[PDB]
């Protein structure tokens, strides 16, 4: 149908629907309201005056044209091609359920800790701190965890914050640190110096979090997505082979 | 000159050499290692490929093809119509200069402080601390600040940090606070306290910067790029302007 006409010729709604469809993003120019589909209209003609007006400046002889042109007509081919190839490829449910199954030791959220420590250079101040604590428990045992930390802790980087480290898994710090911390009871601290590179540590768990299993329903559609693009890769570069193969091709 | 044959049918230099002059960036192919220049050979040849295979399916029949090639050929049309545009827009020095003077008091570098502070909620809090870092100064003053911070200081915000604030501009707090701080010499603390909504601070100041005035020759290429984009949107609509009127349009 026509929605304007310019210099005599009608212009359908149409076209002015397929040069923003790209756009509109699937929602159908006929639903916009009056006053935008009357916009889109204006900015189509004025794309339409510019088109007159290059081909009146014989813009399509120029080279920046016919050259990029030239580009746009053989990329658009192949992309249309490996399109068509896109469309023939789909990932039966067995496939993805079974590459879950093979990988299902994977698919899990490892297990955390959240602490707190003190940082001294030597055996005996650990211990004596961690008898200052001896015998408190819960919130008590933390503010004066805190404290002492605050107090006398040697760590740059967490005696300023009560000796705060936050949430943390096993790939994050070394072995005897986390050895100690992941043995603990919630709420306790160790009631022996932990000793490392760094010195001597008396270290207090606040929580933990246990190994966790990711659920098949939570991954499948990321795993179909990844065995898709891959059998997609597969099929390309087959087909890349089949046509490559089948040329007689010769390097000068 | 001819770099291979495929089929019989000559490849030349210039064809791949044009076909990865976007990728190139302004290198160009003759001066890869032979390695390179094979690879890109190669990838040619397969592009060639898959473009004589899709004719074969009759690809260029495909509305997918048909319809994204009628886009991309007027899409091209109105980007070197505007190109052309683009290449009449020219800002003389006398304009980037101009622009620069005429703003000149907006292309500086605000005054900023680094300063710690304690906060309490009784003037006569504030002026113990006072009293108790009296006749100290330098880096003596600086380590008992942030001691009393840490032991007095009820800003949860930096109260662990001995005070510390950071560099900040006169925008960034409230003015009461601001003004003091701007007001100290380096290295000194407010010998009264300062009265705001959160209560009665004591400020240290560590440094300070003075306003600084950014030259013409910082900022003169960003300038004339941003009167250059100006001067073509300017350009551009006039044109769009020109070519609407011209035009005898009707709206149904």
Same mark, same amino acid.
Not at 68 to 80: F, G, P, S, W
Not at 218 to 240: R, S
């Given at each position: 149908?026509?929605? !304007?006409?310019?210099?005599?010729?009608?212009?359908?709604?149409?076209?002015?629907?397929?040069?923003?469809?790209?756009?509109?993003?699937?929602?159908?120019?006929?639903?916009?309201?009056?006053?935008?589909?009357?916009?889109?209209?204006?900015?189509?003609?004025?794309?339409?005056?510019?088109?007159?007006?290059?081909? /009146?400046?014989?813009?399509?002889?120029?080279?920046?044209?016919?050259?990029?042109?030239?580009?746009?007509?053989?990329?658009?081919?192949?992309?249309? *091609?490996?399109?068509?190839?896109?469309?023939?490829?789909?990932?039966?449910?067995?496939?993805?359920?079974?590459? *879950?199954?093979?990988? @299902?030791?994977? *698919?899990?959220?490892?297990?955390?800790?959240?602490?707190?420590?003190?940082l001294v250079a030597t055996e005996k101040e650990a /211990?004596?701190?961690?008898?200052?604590? @001896?015998?408190?428990?819960?919130?008590?045992?933390?503010?004066?965890?805190?404290?002492? !930390?605050?107090?006398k802790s040697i760590d740059?980087?967490?005696?300023?914050?009560?000796?705060?480290?936050?949430?943390?898994?096993?790939?994050?710090?070394? /072995?005897?640190?986390?050895?100690?911390?992941? !043995?603990? @009871?919630?709420?306790?601290?160790?009631?022996?110096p932990?000793?490392?590179?760094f010195g001597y540590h008396?270290?207090?768990?606040?929580?933990?979090?246990?190994?966790?299993?990711?659920?098949?329903?939570?991954?499948?559609?990321?795993?179909?997505?990844?065995?898709?693009?891959?059998?997609?890769?597969?099929?390309?570069?087959?087909?890349?082979?089949?046509?490559?193969?089948?040329?007689?091709?010769? *390097?000068?």
């Amino acid at each position: 149908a026509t929605v !304007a006409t310019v210099n005599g010729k009608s212009i359908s709604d149409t076209e002015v629907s397929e040069f923003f469809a790209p756009m509109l993003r699937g929602q159908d120019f006929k639903t916009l309201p009056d006053n935008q589909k009357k916009a889109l209209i204006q900015q189509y003609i004025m794309q339409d005056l510019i088109l007159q007006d290059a081909k /009146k400046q014989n813009l399509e002889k120029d080279p920046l044209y016919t050259k990029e042109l030239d580009r746009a007509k053989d990329a658009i081919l192949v992309n249309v *091609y490996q399109e068509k190839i896109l469309n023939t490829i789909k990932i039966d449910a067995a496939k993805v359920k079974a590459f *879950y199954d093979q990988n @299902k030791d994977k *698919y899990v959220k490892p297990a955390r800790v959240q602490a707190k420590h003190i940082l001294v250079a030597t055996e005996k101040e650990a /211990k004596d701190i961690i008898n200052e604590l @001896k015998g408190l428990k819960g919130k008590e045992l933390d503010a004066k965890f805190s404290e002492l !930390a605050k107090e006398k802790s040697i760590d740059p980087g967490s005696k300023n914050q009560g000796g705060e480290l936050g949430w943390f898994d096993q790939s994050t710090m070394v /072995k005897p640190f986390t050895d100690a911390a992941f !043995a603990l @009871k919630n709420g306790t601290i160790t009631t022996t110096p932990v000793k490392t590179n760094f010195g001597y540590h008396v270290i207090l768990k606040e929580n933990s979090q246990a190994k966790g299993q990711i659920k098949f329903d939570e991954v499948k559609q990321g795993i179909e997505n990844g065995l898709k693009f891959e059998e997609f890769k597969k099929v390309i570069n087959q087909k890349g082979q089949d046509l490559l193969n089948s040329a007689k091709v010769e *390097y000068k």
